[PDB]
Coordinates of C-alpha atoms in Angstrom, one line a residue:
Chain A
X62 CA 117.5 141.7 105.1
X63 CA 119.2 139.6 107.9
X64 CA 116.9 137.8 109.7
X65 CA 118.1 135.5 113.0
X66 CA 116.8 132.4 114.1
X67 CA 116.5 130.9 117.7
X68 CA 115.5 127.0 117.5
X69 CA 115.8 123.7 119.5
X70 CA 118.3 121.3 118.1
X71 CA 117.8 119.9 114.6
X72 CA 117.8 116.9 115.8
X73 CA 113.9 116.4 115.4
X74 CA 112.9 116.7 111.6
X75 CA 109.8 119.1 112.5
X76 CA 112.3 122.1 113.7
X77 CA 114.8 121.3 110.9
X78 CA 112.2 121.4 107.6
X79 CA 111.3 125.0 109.4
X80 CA 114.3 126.4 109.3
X81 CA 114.9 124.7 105.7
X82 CA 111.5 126.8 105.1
X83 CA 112.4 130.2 106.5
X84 CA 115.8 129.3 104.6
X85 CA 113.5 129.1 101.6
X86 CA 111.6 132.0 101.9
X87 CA 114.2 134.6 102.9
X88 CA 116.0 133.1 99.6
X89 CA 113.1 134.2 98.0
X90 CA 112.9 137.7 99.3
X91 CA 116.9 137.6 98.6
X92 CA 117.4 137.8 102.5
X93 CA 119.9 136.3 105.0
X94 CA 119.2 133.5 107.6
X95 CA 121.8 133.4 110.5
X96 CA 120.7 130.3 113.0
X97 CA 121.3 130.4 116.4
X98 CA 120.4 127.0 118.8
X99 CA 119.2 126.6 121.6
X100 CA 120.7 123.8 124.5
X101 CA 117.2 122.6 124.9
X102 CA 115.9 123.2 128.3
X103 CA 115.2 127.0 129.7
X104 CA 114.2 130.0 129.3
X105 CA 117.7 131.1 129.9
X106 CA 119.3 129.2 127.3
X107 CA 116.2 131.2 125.2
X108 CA 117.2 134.1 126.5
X109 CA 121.3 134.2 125.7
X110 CA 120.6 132.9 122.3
X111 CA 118.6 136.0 121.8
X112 CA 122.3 137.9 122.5
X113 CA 123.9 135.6 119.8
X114 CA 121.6 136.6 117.6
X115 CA 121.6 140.4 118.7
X116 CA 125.0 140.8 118.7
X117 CA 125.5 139.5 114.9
X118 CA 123.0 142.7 114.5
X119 CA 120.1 140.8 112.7
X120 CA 117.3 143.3 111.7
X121 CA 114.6 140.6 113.0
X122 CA 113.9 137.3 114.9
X123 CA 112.1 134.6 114.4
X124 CA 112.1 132.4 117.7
X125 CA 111.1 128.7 117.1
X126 CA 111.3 127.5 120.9
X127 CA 109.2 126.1 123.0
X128 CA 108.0 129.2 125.9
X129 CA 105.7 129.4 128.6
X130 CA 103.1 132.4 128.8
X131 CA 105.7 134.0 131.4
X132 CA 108.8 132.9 129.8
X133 CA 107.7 134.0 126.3
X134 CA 107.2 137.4 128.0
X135 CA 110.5 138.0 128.9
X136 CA 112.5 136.3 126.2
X137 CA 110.8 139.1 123.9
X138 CA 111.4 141.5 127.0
X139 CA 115.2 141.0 126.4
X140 CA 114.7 140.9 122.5
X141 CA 115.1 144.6 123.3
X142 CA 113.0 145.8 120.4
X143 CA 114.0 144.2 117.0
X144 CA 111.3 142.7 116.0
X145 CA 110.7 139.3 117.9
X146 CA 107.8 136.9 116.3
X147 CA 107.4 133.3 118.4
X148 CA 106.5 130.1 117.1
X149 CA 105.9 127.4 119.8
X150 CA 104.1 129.5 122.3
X151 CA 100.3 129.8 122.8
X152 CA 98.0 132.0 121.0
X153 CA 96.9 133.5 124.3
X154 CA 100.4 134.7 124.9
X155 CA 100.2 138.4 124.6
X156 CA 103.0 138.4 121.9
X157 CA 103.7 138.0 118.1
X158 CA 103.1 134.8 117.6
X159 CA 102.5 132.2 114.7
X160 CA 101.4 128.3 115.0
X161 CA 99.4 125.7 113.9
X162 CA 96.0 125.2 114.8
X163 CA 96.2 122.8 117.7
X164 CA 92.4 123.4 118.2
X165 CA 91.9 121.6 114.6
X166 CA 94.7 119.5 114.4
X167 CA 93.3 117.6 117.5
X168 CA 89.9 117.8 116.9
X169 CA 90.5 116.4 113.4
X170 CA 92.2 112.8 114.5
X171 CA 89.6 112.8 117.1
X172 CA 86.9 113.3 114.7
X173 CA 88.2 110.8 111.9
X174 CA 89.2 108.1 114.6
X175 CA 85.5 108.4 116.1
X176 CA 83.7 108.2 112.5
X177 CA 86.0 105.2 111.5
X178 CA 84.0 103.8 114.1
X179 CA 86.4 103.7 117.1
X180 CA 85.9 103.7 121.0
X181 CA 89.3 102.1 122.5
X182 CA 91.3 105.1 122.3
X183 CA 94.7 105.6 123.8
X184 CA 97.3 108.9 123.5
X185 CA 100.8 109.5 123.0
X186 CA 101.5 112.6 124.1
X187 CA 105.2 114.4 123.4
X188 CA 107.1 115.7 126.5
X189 CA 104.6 118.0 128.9
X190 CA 107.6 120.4 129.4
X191 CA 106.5 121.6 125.9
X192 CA 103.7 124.0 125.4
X193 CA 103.2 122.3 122.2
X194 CA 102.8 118.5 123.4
X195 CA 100.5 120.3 126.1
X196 CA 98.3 122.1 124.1
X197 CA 98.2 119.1 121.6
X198 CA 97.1 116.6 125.0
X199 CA 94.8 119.2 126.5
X200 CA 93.2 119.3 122.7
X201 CA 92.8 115.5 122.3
X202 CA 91.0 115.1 125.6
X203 CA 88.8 118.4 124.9
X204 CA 87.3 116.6 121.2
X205 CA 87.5 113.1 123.1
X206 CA 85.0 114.3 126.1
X207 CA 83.0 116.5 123.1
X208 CA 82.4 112.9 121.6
X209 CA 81.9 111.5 124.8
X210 CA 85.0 108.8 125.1
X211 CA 87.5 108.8 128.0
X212 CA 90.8 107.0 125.9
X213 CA 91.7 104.0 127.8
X214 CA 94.7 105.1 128.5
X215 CA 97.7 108.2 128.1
X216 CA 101.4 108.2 127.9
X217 CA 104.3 110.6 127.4
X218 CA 107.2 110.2 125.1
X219 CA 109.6 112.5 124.1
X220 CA 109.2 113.4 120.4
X221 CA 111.8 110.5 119.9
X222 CA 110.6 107.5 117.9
X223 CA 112.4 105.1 120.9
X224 CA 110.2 107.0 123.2
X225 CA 106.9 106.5 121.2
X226 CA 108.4 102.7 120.8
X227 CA 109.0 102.2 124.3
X228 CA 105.3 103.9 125.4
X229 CA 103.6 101.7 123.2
X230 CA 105.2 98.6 124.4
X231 CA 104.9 99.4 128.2
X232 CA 101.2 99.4 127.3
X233 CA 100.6 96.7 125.4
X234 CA 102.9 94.5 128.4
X235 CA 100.3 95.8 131.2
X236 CA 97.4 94.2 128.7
X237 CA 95.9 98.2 127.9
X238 CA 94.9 97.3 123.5
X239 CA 93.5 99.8 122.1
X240 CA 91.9 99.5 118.4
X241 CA 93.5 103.4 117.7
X242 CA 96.1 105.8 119.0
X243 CA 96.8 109.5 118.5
X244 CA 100.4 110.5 118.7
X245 CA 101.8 114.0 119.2
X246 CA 104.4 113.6 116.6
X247 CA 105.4 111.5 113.9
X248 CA 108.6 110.3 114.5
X249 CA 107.2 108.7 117.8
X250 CA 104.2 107.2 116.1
X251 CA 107.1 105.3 114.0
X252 CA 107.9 103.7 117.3
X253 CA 104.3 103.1 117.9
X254 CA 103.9 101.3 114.8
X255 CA 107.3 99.4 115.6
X256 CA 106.0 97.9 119.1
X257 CA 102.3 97.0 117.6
X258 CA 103.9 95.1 114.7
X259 CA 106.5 93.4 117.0
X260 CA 103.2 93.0 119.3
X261 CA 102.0 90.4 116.6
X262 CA 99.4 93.2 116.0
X263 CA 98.8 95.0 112.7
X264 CA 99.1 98.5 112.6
X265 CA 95.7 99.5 110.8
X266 CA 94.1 96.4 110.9
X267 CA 94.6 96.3 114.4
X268 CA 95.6 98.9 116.4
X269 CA 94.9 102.6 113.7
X270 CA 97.7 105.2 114.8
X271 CA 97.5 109.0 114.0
X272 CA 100.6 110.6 113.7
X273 CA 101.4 114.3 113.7
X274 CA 103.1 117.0 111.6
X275 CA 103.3 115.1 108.4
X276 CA 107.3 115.2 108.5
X277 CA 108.9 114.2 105.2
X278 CA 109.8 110.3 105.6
X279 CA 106.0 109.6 107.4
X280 CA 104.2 108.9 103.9
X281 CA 106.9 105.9 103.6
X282 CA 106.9 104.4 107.0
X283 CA 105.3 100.8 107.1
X284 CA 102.7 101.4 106.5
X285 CA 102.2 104.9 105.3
X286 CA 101.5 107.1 108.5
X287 CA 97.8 109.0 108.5
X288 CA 98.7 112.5 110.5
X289 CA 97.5 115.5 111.3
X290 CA 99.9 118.1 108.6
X291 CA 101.5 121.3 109.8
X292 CA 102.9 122.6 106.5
X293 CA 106.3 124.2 107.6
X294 CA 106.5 125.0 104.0
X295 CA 103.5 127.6 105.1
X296 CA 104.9 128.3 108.5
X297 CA 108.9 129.2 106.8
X298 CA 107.7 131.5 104.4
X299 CA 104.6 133.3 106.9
X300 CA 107.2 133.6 109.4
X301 CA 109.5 135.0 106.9
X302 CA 107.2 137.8 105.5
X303 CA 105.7 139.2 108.2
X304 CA 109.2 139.4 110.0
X305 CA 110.0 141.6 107.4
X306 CA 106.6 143.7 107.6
X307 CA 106.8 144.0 111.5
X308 CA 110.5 145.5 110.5
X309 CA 108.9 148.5 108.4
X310 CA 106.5 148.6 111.5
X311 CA 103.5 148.1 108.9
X312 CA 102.3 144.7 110.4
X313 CA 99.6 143.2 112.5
X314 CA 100.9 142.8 116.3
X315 CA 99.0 139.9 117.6
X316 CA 98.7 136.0 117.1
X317 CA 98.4 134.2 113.7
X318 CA 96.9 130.6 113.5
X319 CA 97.7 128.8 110.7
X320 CA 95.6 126.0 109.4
X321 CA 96.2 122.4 109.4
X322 CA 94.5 119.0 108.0
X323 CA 94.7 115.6 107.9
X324 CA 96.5 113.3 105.8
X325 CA 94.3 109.8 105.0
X326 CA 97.0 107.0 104.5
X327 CA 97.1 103.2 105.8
X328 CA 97.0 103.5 109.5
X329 CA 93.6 104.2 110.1
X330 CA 90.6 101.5 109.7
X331 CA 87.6 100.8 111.0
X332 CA 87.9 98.6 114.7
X333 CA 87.5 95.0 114.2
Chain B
X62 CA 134.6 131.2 120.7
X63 CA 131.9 131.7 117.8
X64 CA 132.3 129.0 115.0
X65 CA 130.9 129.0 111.5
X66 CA 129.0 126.4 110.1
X67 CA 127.6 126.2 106.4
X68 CA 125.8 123.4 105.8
X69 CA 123.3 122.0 103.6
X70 CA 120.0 122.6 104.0
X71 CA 118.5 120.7 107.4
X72 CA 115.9 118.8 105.2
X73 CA 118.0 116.1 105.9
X74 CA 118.7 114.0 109.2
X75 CA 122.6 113.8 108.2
X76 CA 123.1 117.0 108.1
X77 CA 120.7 118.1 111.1
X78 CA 122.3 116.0 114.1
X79 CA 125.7 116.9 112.7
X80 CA 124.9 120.2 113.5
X81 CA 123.5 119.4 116.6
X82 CA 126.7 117.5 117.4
X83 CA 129.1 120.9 116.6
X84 CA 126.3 122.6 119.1
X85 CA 126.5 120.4 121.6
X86 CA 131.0 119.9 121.9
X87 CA 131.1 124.1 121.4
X88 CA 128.7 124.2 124.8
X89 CA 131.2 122.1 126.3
X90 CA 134.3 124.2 125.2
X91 CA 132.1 127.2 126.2
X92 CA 131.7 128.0 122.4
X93 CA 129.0 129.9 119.8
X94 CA 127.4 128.4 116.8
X95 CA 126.6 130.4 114.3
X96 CA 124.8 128.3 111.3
X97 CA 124.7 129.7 107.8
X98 CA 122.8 128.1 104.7
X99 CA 123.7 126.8 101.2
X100 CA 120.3 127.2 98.7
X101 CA 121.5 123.8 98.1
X102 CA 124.0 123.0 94.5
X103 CA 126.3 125.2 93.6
X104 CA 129.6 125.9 94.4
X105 CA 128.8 129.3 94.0
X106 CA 125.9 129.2 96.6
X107 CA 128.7 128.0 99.2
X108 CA 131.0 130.9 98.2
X109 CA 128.4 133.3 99.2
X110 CA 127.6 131.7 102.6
X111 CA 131.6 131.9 103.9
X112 CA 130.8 135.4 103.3
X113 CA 127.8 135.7 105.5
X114 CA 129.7 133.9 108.1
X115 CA 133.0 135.7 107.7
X116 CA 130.9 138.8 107.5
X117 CA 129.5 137.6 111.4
X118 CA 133.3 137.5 112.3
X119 CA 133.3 134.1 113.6
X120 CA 136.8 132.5 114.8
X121 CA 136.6 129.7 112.9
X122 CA 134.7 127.6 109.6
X123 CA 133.5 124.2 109.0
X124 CA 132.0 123.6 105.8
X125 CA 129.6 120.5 106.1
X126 CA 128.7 121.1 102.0
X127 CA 129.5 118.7 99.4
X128 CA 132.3 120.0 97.0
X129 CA 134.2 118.8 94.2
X130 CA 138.3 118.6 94.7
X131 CA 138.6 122.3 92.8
X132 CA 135.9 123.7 94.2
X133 CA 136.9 122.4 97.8
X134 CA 139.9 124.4 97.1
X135 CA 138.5 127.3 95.5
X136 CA 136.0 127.8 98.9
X137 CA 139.0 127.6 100.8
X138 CA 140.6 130.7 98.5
X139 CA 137.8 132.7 99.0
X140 CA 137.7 131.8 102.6
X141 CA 140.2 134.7 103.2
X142 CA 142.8 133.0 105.9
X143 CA 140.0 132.2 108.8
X144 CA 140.5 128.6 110.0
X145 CA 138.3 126.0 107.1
X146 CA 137.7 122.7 108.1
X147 CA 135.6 120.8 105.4
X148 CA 133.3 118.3 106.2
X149 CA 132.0 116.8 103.0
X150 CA 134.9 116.5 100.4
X151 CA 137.4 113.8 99.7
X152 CA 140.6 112.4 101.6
X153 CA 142.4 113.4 98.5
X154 CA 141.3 117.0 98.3
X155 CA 144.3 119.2 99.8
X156 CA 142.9 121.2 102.3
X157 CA 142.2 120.9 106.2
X158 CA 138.9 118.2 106.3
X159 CA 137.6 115.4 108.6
X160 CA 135.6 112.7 106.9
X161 CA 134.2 109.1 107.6
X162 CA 136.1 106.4 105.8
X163 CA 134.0 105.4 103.0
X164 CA 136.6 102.9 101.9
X165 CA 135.9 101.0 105.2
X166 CA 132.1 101.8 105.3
X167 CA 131.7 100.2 102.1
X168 CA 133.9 97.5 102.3
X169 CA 131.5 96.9 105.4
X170 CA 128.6 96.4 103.6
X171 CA 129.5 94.3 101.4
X172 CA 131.1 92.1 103.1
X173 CA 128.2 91.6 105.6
X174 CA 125.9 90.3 102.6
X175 CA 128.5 88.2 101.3
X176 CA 129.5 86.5 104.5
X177 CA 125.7 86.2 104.5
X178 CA 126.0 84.2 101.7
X179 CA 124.3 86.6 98.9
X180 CA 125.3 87.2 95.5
X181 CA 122.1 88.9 93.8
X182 CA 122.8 92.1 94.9
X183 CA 121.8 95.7 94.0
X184 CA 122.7 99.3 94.2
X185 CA 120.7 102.5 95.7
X186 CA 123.4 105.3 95.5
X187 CA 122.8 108.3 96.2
X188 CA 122.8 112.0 94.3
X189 CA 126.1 111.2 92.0
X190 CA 126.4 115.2 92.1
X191 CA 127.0 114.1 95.8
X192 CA 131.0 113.8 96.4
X193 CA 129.9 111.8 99.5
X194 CA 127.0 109.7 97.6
X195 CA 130.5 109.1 94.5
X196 CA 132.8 108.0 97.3
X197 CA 130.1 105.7 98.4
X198 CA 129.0 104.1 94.9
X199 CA 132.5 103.2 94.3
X200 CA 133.3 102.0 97.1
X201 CA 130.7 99.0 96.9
X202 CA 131.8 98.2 93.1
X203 CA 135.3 97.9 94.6
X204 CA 134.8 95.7 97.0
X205 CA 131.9 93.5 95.1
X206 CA 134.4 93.4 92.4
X207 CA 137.1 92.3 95.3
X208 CA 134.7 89.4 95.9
X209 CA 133.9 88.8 92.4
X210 CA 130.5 90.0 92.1
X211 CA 128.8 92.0 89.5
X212 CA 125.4 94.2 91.2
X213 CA 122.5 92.4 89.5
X214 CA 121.3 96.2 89.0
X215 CA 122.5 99.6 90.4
X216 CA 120.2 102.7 90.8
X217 CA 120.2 106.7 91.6
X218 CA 118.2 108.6 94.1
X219 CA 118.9 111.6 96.1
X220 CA 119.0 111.0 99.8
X221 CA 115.3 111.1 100.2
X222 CA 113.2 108.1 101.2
X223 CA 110.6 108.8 98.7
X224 CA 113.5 108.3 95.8
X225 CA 114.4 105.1 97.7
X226 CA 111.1 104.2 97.0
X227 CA 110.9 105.3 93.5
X228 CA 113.7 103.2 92.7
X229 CA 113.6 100.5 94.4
X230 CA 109.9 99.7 93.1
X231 CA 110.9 100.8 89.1
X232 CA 113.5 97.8 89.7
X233 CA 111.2 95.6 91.4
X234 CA 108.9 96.1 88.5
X235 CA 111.4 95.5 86.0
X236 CA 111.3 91.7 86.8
X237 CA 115.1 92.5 88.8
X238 CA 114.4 91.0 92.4
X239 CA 118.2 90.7 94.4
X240 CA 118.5 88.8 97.8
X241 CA 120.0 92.1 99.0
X242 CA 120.7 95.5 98.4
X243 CA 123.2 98.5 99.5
X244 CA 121.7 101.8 99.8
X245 CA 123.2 104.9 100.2
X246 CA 121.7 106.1 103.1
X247 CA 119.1 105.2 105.8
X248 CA 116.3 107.5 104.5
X249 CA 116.6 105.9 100.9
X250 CA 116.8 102.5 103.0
X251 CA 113.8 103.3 104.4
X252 CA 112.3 104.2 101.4
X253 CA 113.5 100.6 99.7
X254 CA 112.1 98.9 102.7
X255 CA 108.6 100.3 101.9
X256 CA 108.9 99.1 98.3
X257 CA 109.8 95.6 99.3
X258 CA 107.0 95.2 101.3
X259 CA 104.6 95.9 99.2
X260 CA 106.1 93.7 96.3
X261 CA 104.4 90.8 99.0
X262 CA 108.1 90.4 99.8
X263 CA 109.6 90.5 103.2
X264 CA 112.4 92.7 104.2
X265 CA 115.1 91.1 105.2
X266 CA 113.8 87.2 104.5
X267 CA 113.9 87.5 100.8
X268 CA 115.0 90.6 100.4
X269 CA 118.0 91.9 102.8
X270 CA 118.8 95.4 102.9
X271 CA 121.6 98.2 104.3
X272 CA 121.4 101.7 105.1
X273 CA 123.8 103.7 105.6
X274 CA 124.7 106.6 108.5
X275 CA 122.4 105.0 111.1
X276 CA 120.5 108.0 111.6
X277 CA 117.9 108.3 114.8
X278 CA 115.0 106.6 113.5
X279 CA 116.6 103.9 111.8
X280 CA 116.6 101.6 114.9
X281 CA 112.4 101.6 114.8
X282 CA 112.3 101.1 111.3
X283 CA 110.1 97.9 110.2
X284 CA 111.9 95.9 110.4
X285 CA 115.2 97.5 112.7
X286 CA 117.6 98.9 109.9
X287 CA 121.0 96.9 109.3
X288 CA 123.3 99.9 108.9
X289 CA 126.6 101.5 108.6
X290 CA 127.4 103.6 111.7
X291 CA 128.0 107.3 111.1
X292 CA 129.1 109.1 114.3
X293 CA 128.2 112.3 113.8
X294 CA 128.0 113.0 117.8
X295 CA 132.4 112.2 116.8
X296 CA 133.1 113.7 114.0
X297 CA 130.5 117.3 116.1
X298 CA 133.2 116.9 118.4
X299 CA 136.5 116.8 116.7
X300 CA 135.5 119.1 113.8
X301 CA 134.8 121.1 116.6
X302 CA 137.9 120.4 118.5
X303 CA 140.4 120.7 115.6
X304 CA 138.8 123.8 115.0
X305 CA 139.7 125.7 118.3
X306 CA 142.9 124.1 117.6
X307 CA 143.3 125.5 114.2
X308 CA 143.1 128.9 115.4
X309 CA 145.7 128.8 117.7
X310 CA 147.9 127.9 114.8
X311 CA 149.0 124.3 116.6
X312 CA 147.2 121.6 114.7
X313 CA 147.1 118.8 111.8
X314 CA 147.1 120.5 108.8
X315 CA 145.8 117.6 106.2
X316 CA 142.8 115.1 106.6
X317 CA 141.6 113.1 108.9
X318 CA 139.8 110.6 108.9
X319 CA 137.0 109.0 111.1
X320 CA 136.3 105.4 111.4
X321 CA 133.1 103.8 111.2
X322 CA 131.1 100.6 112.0
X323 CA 128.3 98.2 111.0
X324 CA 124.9 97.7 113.5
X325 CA 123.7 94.4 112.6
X326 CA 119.8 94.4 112.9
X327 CA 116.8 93.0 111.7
X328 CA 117.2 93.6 107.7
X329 CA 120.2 91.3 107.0
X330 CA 119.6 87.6 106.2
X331 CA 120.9 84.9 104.3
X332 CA 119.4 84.4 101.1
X333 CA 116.5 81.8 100.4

């Protein structure tokens, strides 16, 4: 009935509204949800949050951390035994995992940028230290080469919206315009959209931007941010339930993939 | 060592990098965070979560919920002797809390569009079941009235930018169209800001507006977000601090009370 949770700071909205959903779920189920955080970087930081967690003698854990193949491994390896389901790993991991389709979620704002019509592509990828912004970059070029279009140029931001702000800009200084751009996150596609309007250039109109996640505040940003949506409301209350299952030892042991889809708003248009 | 945080739930950015801020000074004391969950109003729901905490055995409390001056005390009762430092209450409530001064955070505001030359101004406070959002709302009528000036309209949401939205276009459609408005938080601001623009009216040029907190994103808003500063990275910190201190029987034991600041941007302008 007490269920522990291992995350990266709040400070990004997408980790937050999770733990808001698990919050929610275990409600719900009338269950208990002790967090635990993480001080970003390292499997090691992982790793003794796990003992936090242990210690306060949680009968499950839901890890919502960004882990290598290897590191994932061990973090669960030290999980001695209560039950230990991942969240930001890859489905290949050999663990108990549950994500979001990046396979669809990148195909999908490849697929509605190309119909709209659009060839000048560029990509805002989140940090590469996270399995997530990798899997999310690997996916975006995958569906681009599919459709046979190289983007015209690649950055890396930080999850941050300054990051996404300052990405954008740096490109548009060296002269690289693209007519559409697919961020790995919201938040930073707000900073896209800050630099292309401050760039004289309409967002939309001008330059489409694809954001990620679907985050609460995105559907009033200016102007309301298309994205690819990763209902945490789905992911808090999965999570939660099968936590509980794998408890009572009467639960599937794998990978789960969760769907995803995309959002239609006023960033995307055709090119001009 | 292990602290005891229960806060409201992480939907919101407030609350989020507050917590992140308590993380981040209890790694520097070489410190635990444990992070319990209120299912949102009640007093009742708070109650409960001391007991989740106190149940973990941690050294120490800090309530980041908002109560009401009896229920403030009453949470204290029931928080059976452990050191409780409330977050979200008022100066006047007697018990041990650390607060930003919404006497000066107001007074701030309106003061900024007045110096500004405005006088058709407006009102986006926030939850009034909100101790915090009360503080605030009062604290512009005091100083507007100070300055001799009546709102031209005041409204209600609830922290969320889609209520700042709501609001701000109901009023826009009711004909009332200030030269500036005071919002009770940056996410409502945001919200507002969307409105405005597509009312064909430009933030900031004919329609000034300020947040309040100056959360992350708020500096990439369109355009940049005139705000009131909120340190939460501070008051992490010395909530944190006092905390430890608390323990060890050798600290302040009334209310403190945190200063704060206003971040001129690109929202505030003299009227047309």
């Amino acid at each position: 009935l007490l269920i522990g949770v291992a995350t990266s700071s709040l400070a990004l909205h997408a980790p937050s509204q999770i733990v808001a959903a698990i919050k929610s779920r275990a409600d719900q189920l009338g269950a208990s949800v002790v967090v635990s955080m993480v001080e970003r970087s390292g499997v090691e930081a992982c790793k003794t949050a796990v003992h936090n967690l242990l210690a306060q003698r949680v009968s499950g854990l839901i890890i919502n951390y960004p882990l290598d193949d290897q590191d994932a491994i061990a973090v669960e390896a030290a999980c001695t035994n209560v039950p230990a389901l991942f969240l930001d790993v890859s489905d290949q991991t050999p663990i108990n995992s549950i994500i979001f389709s990046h396979e669809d979620g990148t195909r999908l704002g490849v697929e509605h940028l190309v119909a709209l019509g659009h060839q000048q592509i560029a990509l805002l990828a989140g940090p590469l230290s996270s399995v997530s912004a990798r899997l999310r970059l690997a996916g975006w070029h995958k569906y681009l080469t599919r459709n046979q279009i190289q983007p015209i140029a690649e950055r890396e931001g930080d999850w941050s919206a300054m990051s996404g702000f300052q990405q954008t800009m740096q490109m548009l200084n060296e002269g690289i315009v693209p007519t559409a751009m697919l961020v790995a996150n919201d938040q930073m596609a707000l900073g896209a959209m800050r630099a292309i309007t401050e760039s004289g250039l309409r967002v939309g109109a001008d330059i489409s931007v694809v954001g990620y996640d679907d985050t609460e505040d995105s559907s009033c940003y200016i102007p309301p941010l298309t994205t690819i949506k990763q209902d945490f409301r789905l992911l808090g209350q999965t999570s939660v339930d099968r936590l509980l299952q794998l408890s009572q030892g009467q639960a599937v042991k794998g990978n789960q993939l969760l769907p995803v889809s995309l959002v239609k708003r006023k960033t995307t248009l055709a090119p001009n």
